[PDB]
Design a protein around this nucleic acid. Sequence first.
DNA 1: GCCATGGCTAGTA
DNA 2: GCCATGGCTAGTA
Length: 108
Amino acid sequence: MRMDEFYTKVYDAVCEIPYGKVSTYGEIARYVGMPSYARQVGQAMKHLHPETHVPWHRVINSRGTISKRDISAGEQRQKDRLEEEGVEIYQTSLGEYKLNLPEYMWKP
DNA sequence: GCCATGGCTAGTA
DNA sequence: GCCATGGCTAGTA
């Protein structure tokens, strides 16, 4: 499979995560049949434009935290979105935001 | 080509 | 560890 397809397949899968659930880079990656490709799902999400109607906020790492995402710390926005979805998050010592995976985890 | 740089993470320590 | 992108440079031609 070529990139650009992959992407389309990701976004498809991401568009499938239910309102108020979530998944992880890792899961998605395996979902679309390329388990080794977490990081890239990462990047697929990165490249989307704001105007997207693709649920990129519903994807976080396997440690139930909002991925660091150093460049453009304006990922604060991912938090907001997720709260208004009802999902409930808190911070940590060392900052970060985090939630209860077993609950919110989309178990397809 | 070799190398650093990422919204990573299963399995060690 | 895994793996794409993209910016350097040995060193072929």
